[PDB]
Amino acid sequence: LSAEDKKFLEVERALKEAALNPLRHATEELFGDFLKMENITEICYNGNKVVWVLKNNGEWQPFDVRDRKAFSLSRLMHFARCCASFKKKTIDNYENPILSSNLANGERVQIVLSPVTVNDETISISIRIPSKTTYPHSFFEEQGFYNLLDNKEQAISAIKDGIAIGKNVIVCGGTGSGKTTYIKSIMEFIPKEERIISIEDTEEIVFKHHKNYTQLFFGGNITSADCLKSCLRMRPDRIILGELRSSEAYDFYNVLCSGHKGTLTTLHAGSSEEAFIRLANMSSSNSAARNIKFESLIEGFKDLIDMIVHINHHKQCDEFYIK
Amino acid sequence: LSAEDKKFLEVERALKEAALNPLRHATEELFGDFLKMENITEICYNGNKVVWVLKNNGEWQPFDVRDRKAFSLSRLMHFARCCASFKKKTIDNYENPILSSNLANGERVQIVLSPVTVNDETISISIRIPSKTTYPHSFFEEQGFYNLLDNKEQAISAIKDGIAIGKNVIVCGGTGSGKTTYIKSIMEFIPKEERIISIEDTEEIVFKHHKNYTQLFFGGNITSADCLKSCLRMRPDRIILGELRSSEAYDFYNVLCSGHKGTLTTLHAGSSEEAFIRLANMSSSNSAARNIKFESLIEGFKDLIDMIVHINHHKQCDEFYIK
Amino acid sequence: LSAEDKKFLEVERALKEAALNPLRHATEELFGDFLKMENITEICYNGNKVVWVLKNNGEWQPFDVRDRKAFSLSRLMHFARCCASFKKKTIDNYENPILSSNLANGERVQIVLSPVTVNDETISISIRIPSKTTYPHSFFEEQGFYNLLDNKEQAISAIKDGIAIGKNVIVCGGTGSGKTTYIKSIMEFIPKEERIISIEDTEEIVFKHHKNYTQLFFGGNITSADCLKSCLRMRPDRIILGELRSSEAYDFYNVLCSGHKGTLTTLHAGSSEEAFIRLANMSSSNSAARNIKFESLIEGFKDLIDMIVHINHHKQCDEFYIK
Amino acid sequence: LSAEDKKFLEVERALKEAALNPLRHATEELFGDFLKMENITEICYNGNKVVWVLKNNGEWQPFDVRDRKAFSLSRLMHFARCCASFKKKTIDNYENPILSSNLANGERVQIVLSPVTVNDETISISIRIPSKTTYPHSFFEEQGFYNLLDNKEQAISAIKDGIAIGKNVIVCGGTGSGKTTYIKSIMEFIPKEERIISIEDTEEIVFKHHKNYTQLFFGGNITSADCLKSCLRMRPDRIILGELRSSEAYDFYNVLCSGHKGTLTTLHAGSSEEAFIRLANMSSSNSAARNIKFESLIEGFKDLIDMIVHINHHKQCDEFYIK
Amino acid sequence: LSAEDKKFLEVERALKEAALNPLRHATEELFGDFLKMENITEICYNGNKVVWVLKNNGEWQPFDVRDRKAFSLSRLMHFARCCASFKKKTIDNYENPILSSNLANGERVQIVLSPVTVNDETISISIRIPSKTTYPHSFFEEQGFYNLLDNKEQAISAIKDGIAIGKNVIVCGGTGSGKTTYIKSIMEFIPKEERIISIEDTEEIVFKHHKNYTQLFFGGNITSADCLKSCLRMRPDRIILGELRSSEAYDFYNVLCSGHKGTLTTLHAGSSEEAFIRLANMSSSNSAARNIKFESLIEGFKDLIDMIVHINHHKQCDEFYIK
Amino acid sequence: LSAEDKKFLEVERALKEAALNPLRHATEELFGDFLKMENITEICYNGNKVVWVLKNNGEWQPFDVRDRKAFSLSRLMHFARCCASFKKKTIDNYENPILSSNLANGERVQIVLSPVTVNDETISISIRIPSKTTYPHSFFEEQGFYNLLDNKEQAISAIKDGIAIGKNVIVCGGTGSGKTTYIKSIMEFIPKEERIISIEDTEEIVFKHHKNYTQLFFGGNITSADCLKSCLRMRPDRIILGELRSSEAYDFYNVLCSGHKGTLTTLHAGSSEEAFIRLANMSSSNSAARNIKFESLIEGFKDLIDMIVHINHHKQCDEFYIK
Numbered sequence A, B, C, D, E, F: 001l002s003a004e005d006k007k008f009l010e011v012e013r014a015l016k017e018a019a020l021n022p023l024r025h026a027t028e029e030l031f032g033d034f035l036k037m038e039n040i041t042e043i044c045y046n047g048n049k050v051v052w053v054l055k056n057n058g059e060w061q062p063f064d065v066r067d068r069k070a071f072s073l074s075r076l077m078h079f080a081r082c083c084a085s086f087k088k089k090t091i092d093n094y095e096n097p098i099l100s101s102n103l104a105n106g107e108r109v110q111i112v113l114s115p116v117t118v119n120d121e122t123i124s125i126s127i128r129i130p131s132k133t134t135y136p137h138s139f140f141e142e143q144g145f146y147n148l149l150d151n152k153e154q155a156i157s158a159i160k161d162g163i164a165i166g167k168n169v170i171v172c173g174g175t176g177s178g179k180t181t182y183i184k185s186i187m188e189f190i191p192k193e194e195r196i197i198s199i200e201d202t203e204e205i206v207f208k209h210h211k212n213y214t215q216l217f218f219g220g221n222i223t224s225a226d227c228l229k230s231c232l233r234m235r236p237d238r239i240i241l242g243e244l245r246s247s248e249a250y251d252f253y254n255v256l257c258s259g260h261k262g263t264l265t266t267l268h269a270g271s272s273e274e275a276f277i278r279l280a281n282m283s284s285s286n287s288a289a290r291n292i293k294f295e296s297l298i299e300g301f302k303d304l305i306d307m308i309v310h311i312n313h314h315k316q317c318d319e320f321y322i323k
């Protein structure tokens, strides 16, 4: 069937390779050395002959690229153009100086040009590196993930036993704090017989304890809401929503309201209460919420969310809310 | 008259068989062995050479299909196209990677293609098997359906008598819990002299006690609201609405507010209170509810619903709300 | 003037006869025997060779039509097609499987086809028979219409004296309970010098005690609201609104608010209070109500409605609300 | 200048007489005898060979017209067409069976045709006779207008003096009660030095005490709001708004809120309180009121209206609300 | 530069003169004698051979123009046509019988024609004469502007010292009461070093104590809001808003909310509190206010307005609100 | 690489210089002497042969330009056109008499022409000079910036330490008070290791303590919301939003609600409380805020804003709100 399968994919593969190879070459040329670096979370070029890399230890390390032709205005613009085209977009110095796209393997990219940047010779690029490593929960415990807590042994038992039972857990905190890395490690305590369905923007979640699952990805014309809606027609036991953002908020609400089994999700929020308040906000941005009261929404989540885990800028839990 | 009926149906039957036979063959070809299985509730192929089946006992059973040509990419894709075309739709790797359709006999089907799936060689399919068996209420009793209740004899008498009198009953719980199977066995206590009108998507309700009845089905351009609206112009005694979903919620509301006799329906809700809240929500998503207060809607349902029955994940009633 | 009047109507009559005669023949062919039956309220064909008739005594009587060619698929489809065309509509197995229309003399008809009905050989038809008989109030008294009341002689005097004075009365209850038949009998106590204007969908109201009146009928492009609005420009003493349904609700509201004389109307409602609540609902579905509070509407009707009469399924008054 | 004025008006007069004379003849032909009658308030033909006239004493008088060619269907229809065309409209048995128009001299006219009327041979017409007579306030006093009041001398002094000072007065009650006739006689107490601007549909208000004034009439594309808006740009002292209807309500509100001197108007309301509620309602039907609370609107009118006068069906004041 | 400047304006001047001269001649012909009159505030022609002039002493003085050809229908229509054209409008007896325009020097004009006026030979015209005289504050004091006050010397010191400091003052009252004349006189107490920017419809404000200022005027396609918005980009010390009316209300609100320096404005209102209520009303008519509460708006103005001055119909202050 | 960079920029530079040089000459020609002046904040020409300059000490200084050809009407008009064309706009005496644009180096410019100005020979121009100087925090201290406070040493320590920790600070006051100059000097206390991203209209913020940063500018089709939205996809540590205006308010809100690190911004508000109210207002003008309560928005900001600093018209802090 492989031979017969190769002829089946021949046309579609060919079309991707023609569109992606120019971008694979430009990406390696400019950022190969940096994308090879260990424990990095972001790479940024500020348009001034210096590349800034952000380590997981919260430190920014600059690199001089003054003597490289890859950081020549014409090479940078080629790269930008390869990025836009890959996602069927355009980037120019008029109606499209800001561009959102992805590299060949999925990492998100943000490019800005003149007139939006300070001047003529300044091109701005920033790439976000996905969570590509899985640390076992045991590791978190050893690194003292729960030490800033008063009920350390109570937190560690609520998480493990809570998720085994299928409670709706939310992991929140600021960017690059470890939310995605954390939800991944706790998937250990989901029974191995559970059917799991994930909704992501970029492949990050790995399945090492489950054989019955399906990954769903959004982008371009397929929204997050589309996937979630499709997900409900695919009989899941658990639903892992990569991260909440906007209108998906409301659709998420109803999924908890139909009394559905254990949902895992990440979200940007400063604390438990800022979360319950943030869930109501994002939820109002979606049409089918107009006739619903803000207090009605906040009181809903507070009744459906079984536990919230917040993480500070030092990658440690400093609040373990439980209902 | 059968000779004349046959010539009357000649053109429509020919058009359906032309469009449905490519589908019947492909469906048999891939899932014939699985659709023959007993006591199943779902069939899922996760695009990785294994077919997962969900049994009524809540267990998933994997089946290896590595040495089958039916699960070859070209054969799967032929099946997907046959699924789309049957419902006058299209499925492709661009603007239509997600598809909702039905098999020849009604079972709902969900298909996802790349770029939404994880990759190029991954096609995801999931089929939902309808409630095709009728178990007599006596059977539920014997299986200990009400054993988890403090008022067992009181519940069993509220149901039998309540429904004989024509009270508005609702059965909620999660997917595959047995709500449809339950409302079916309960129809025994509806007087045989009652005209019954049902509204379903897939044929599931059988009539073994009633001779005066009409079934209405929705799909495509015909909404559930449409059938409900036609229903009211058909003079029913009882109305069985297969399952509440979005906009129908509000039309449902009015039918209760007009004093109408015993309505029976199913809903996805975690509990009595979550139901009263859920009915208010879905009811707000429909236009002619704009000027209505959420508190007005929730209390309206509370006064009109005579009794709610919730079912856990073990197929047992764990709450018998009565007004 | 009759000769000169016949030539005036010649063209319009001819056009109706060409359109209505095919329907007069098809109607007699299939349902003549049933439309001749005494004390019936509805006739239904479920598409299974049996015609069900509903008696005023609440009993359904089946009739076997297995040996009739009028109930042949081709004869049934002809009938359906004659119904649609008469109201300038279309009925088919695609975008128009549900049809609402009327027979030649006004009775409302509801036809449903495949794919909405269960299958290929099932055509559903249901005809509602209008109130065509007038029972004198005395009759209601003799049949014990008010016996289930604690203040029987008080009810009988409030109705008679109340309507003589011109109070806003509402008759409510479920379908086929006798609301229309009741409002008709009480018209006896409206002074014979009153100018009366009725708004109906189907001619049912007769005038045996009044000489100064005008009947108004709605349908197709002329809504109920249109008639009511026209009615207010025709100087009425009393207004008899056949039955409240939707947007007419609000227009009805203002008619009571301008402090207008005695209005009679029927409505589907389970009880007094469900009525005041139902009047507010229907009233919000009409645009010019957006800026009005639900409590503002309910409190209005409660101040303008002078008495409500509710009727149960046994055709007896079981609640006589008075303000 | 009259010779030059005549040539200036030649083309417009010719165009009006061409369009109005077919109407003057048909109107004379059918209703000449009835429009000559004294003390009438309405003329109705119910399509059944009888013309009903409503006298100021509240009695209806029938007149047999069975042997008149004017009430022949073709002659009635000619009259209807002449009515429609005069106001650049159309009347037919399809999309325009209901017509609102005016006779040559202004009287409003309402015409209804089949299918809206009961049948083919039924044409309904109703004509409203304007307040064409002025009775001096002294006459109202002599007829016992205020005899139903506890504070007779106090009412009669509040009116005379109140209006002399310029307070905002409203006259309400039902159709044909005498509100317009009342506000007319009351104008006696408005100082003769006041510039008065009126807004009517039909000419009814006469000026026997004032020399500085301008009349504004609305109809067709010119709304009441239009005239009110122009009015404010004409520097009035007093404003007489013939009668409040829909949207004008809100524009009316603002005029009171700007401190403007004594406004006089008529409204259809059952009582003082029903008026304050009715003004809030009609005021909400106009856009620029969306963001205004119903309680805000009701209280606004209460503080601004200086005195309301209600009139029963016997043409007597039965409530004299003063602030 | 004057010679070079004349050639620069040659084309635009020529175009205005061709459009304005016909109107300069028609205006002098009909109203020259009246526009020359001293202390007048309005001139009105009611279409009945009499011109009414309104003196500042509140008296209307009629003038007979029966023997003038300028008041011939053809001369009046020429004048009307010259007015419409000047503002690029049209005036006729169909879709444009109401016209708002201005004479050559700015005065506002309102013309109404048949069918809106009573009849065929009646043309209505009304011209408002702008405040063209500046009385020094001392004069107001001598005429006893503050005598009806209990704290006369307190009022006179609050106004003088308050405006010197830059407090937000509002002058209100009815038309022709002296609001504009009053704000003009108090500009004496604005420090002469202040940059002043006015927003007017008609030039009325004079600058006799300030050298650094710019006048802004609205009309046609340039709204009041446009000017105010432009004004905020022209670094003003004080802002004098000729008069508040509608949507400008809200824009005005924000200008006070950004904590901006001393604003002077006039408004039509019966009293202090009617003003705070009127400011909230007009403010809601502007889109960007939808999500703001009426009580939220009223409480805002009440916190930002430092003092209100109301004037009665005798040109005297009868209420001096201070916060 | 500079040779290749030059050829890469050849076409864009040529296009800008073609469009910008006519502007550089005209600008030099009229305002060269004034743009060279020290410590100015605005330049205004009021169309009357005098140029007004506003000095940092709040004084306006007039300069006579009567004998200059640059202020000739044709030369001023050439300059206006050059201003409009540079920003792809048009300025004329019809539909575009008001213009908002910028000079060659960024300074904002506002131009008004007749009919908006008082007359034909009057062209109004006003130029805003950007904060182009950086004064060290120590300088503010020496000038007595905090001397008007009761808690001087407490304010000076809350600022230094507060900002070092990353609290959300806001600087408000009126135009030209020194908010931008203040936030600039305060950046000293932001750790040098922080990645800073700024959003301005005109380049004003300098970076003398930070090496990792990116500037974003908005104008034309690129909104402030756009840059803020791109900003969040660039991984900043601190975000400096030049100044809050309309819609950005709400996007700003969310950024605070996501727990994001220390944001610094400027706003036009009279005081702390006026700010919290002002943030709620501007935030409501943006769509996705519809379903949010004004009280919900005001309290949201209060909990998230860590400290507000207001500045009077003498360039001194007169209120130091801390949470």
Ligand SMILES: Nc1ncnc2c1ncn2[C@@H]1O[C@H](COP(=O)(O)OP(=O)(O)O)[C@@H](O)[C@H]1O
Pocket: B039, B040, B041, B056, B130, B131, B132, B133, B140, B143, B174, B175, B176, B177, B178, B179, B180, B181, B182, B266, B315
């Ligand atoms: N009480 C029961 N005992 C054994 N099997 C059951 C029972 N109730 C339902 N089932 C089986 O479980 C499956 C799911 O039931 P169904 O009524 O369709 O669920 P729901 O509508 O709530 O998703 C069916 O195939 C049915 O035959």
Ligand SMILES: Nc1ncnc2c1ncn2[C@@H]1O[C@H](COP(=O)(O)OP(=O)(O)O)[C@@H](O)[C@H]1O
Pocket: D039, D040, D041, D056, D130, D131, D132, D133, D140, D143, D174, D175, D176, D177, D178, D179, D180, D181, D182, D266, D315
């Ligand atoms: N006080 C009165 N006495 C006798 N006749 C009256 C009196 N008031 C009104 N009428 C007559 O009654 C009719 C209706 O009066 P009108 O003022 O037009 O009523 P409304 O505007 O309230 O409908 C008129 O023809 C008028 O001449």
Ligand SMILES: Nc1ncnc2c1ncn2[C@@H]1O[C@H](COP(=O)(O)OP(=O)(O)O)[C@@H](O)[C@H]1O
Pocket: E039, E040, E041, E056, E130, E131, E132, E133, E135, E140, E143, E174, E175, E176, E177, E178, E179, E180, E181, E182, E266, E315
């Ligand atoms: N104090 C005063 N004494 C005499 N005449 C005045 C006085 N104040 C105003 N007037 C005159 O009265 C008229 C009132 O108009 P105006 O001042 O513009 O008031 P508003 O804007 O409120 O209509 C003007 O023609 C003005 O010249």
Ligand SMILES: Nc1ncnc2c1ncn2[C@@H]1O[C@H](COP(=O)(O)OP(=O)(O)O)[C@@H](O)[C@H]1O
Pocket: F039, F040, F041, F056, F130, F131, F132, F133, F140, F143, F174, F175, F176, F177, F178, F179, F180, F181, F182, F266, F315
């Ligand atoms: N504390 C200060 N002392 C002296 N001059 C100042 C001070 N603060 C600001 N300035 C000057 O005043 C002008 C306006 O300051 P700026 O920060 O741009 O105001 P804002 O943004 O609030 O309008 C600038 O030209 C600046 O150089």
